[PDB]
Each structure stands twice: as C-alpha cells, then as structure tokens.
Ligand binder design. Structure first.
Ligand code: HEM
Ligand SMILES: Cc1ccccc1O
Length: 137
C-alpha cells in the first residue's frame, strides 16, 4: 500500500525523483515557466545538471516525509503550511501541485510494480486541499 510505496521510492529515490519530475515536465511543458534553466534540454541532459538532480531529490526527500507523516493519505497541517510559506513556492497555485501528482500517479500506473496508485491520487488531492486551507491560491 501507500506506506510500502514510500519505502520503495526511498530505496531508489534519486532515480524515482528524476524520472517522476521528468514525467511531470514532459506531460506539462508549460510548467517550465517555473523552471527556466531546464528549457531546451533532453531528459539525459537534465540528469547531468547538478541543480536538477540535487533539487529534485530534495523535493522528493521532503515529499516522502510529508507522505510518511500523513494518516490515511491526509498530510499534517504543519507540512501544508511549510509548503505554502516556503519562499521557493512564492509563484505557485494548487494547480501546479495537482499536475505534479497527476504525473506521479500516471508514472506509477505505467510501472510494472504494485504501487498503490489510488492512494497517491488521494494523497495529491488531500495535499492540494491542505495547501488551499493553508492559503495557497
Ligand atoms: C509535494 C510537493 C513538493 C515538495 C515536497 C516540494 C519541496 C521543495 C523543496 C524541498 C525545495 C527546495 C529544493 C532545493 O533548493 O534544493 C523546493 C524548491 C522549489 N519548488 Fe517545490 N516542492 C513540491 C512541489 C512543487 C511544485 C508542484 C512546483 C512547481 C510546479 C514547485 C516549485 C519549486 C521551485 C520553483 C523551487 C525552487 C527552484 C528550483 O528548485 O528549481 N514545487 N520544493
Ligand atoms: C524544484 C524542483 C522540483 C523537481 C525537480 C527539479 C526541481 O528543480
């Protein structure tokens, strides 16, 4: 289920973080408005760029912590607050997060692995709800 999936992702996190983030940027190319230095680069070129690997892994490090601290795929209000208040998220609206979780769920469905994709879907929905409650537009 969801908790096992956190363990699975954490066992190969730099690879999963990069591959899921690439799935997001390729599904929603307009999202590079937020990631100007990733423009004009193939997947293999991005997987060579230091901030790409470093930043995406740190994003997924925190995402797995938020998922692990959740109960029944509902994140802590403290975690939602942190994600809204972060200066690096100043630009953002809940639709940016919705898209990331659409890509993550479609990645998991496309995988051979017994990921609990319905739980990740609910998690993404519940995190968007919590971000809206915590003041994200
Ligand atoms: C649960 C989802 C997310 C988590 C846990 C998260 C977490 C983080 C973390 C930890 C950083 C700092 C990275 C670093 O400086 O090394 C960061 C930076 C950033 N995040 Fe998020 N983030 C999430 C979703 C998003 C989404 C959906 C967007 C935009 C579509 C976004 C845009 C950014 C940007 C622009 C930065 C700073 C610039 C950059 O690192 O490229 N984040 N995020
Ligand atoms: C902030 C961020 C998130 C996911 C992948 C790369 C990246 O720079």
């Amino acid at each position: 289920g969801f908790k096992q999936d956190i363990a699975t992702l954490r066992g190969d996190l730099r690879t999963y973080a990069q591959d899921i983030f690439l799935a997001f940027l390729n599904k929603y190319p307009d999202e590079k408005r937020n990631f100007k230095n990733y423009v004009g680069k193939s997947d293999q070129e991005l997987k060579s760029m230091a901030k790409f690997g470093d930043h995406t892994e740190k994003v997924f490090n925190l995402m797995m912590e938020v998922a692990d601290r959740a109960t029944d795929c509902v994140p802590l209000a403290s975690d939602a607050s942190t994600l809204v208040q972060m200066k690096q998220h100043s630009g953002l609206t809940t639709g940016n997060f919705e898209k990331l979780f659409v890509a993550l769920v479609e990645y998991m469905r496309a995988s051979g692995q017994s990921f609990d994709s319905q739980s990740w879907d609910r998690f993404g929905k519940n995190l968007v709800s919590a971000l809206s409650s915590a003041g994200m537009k």
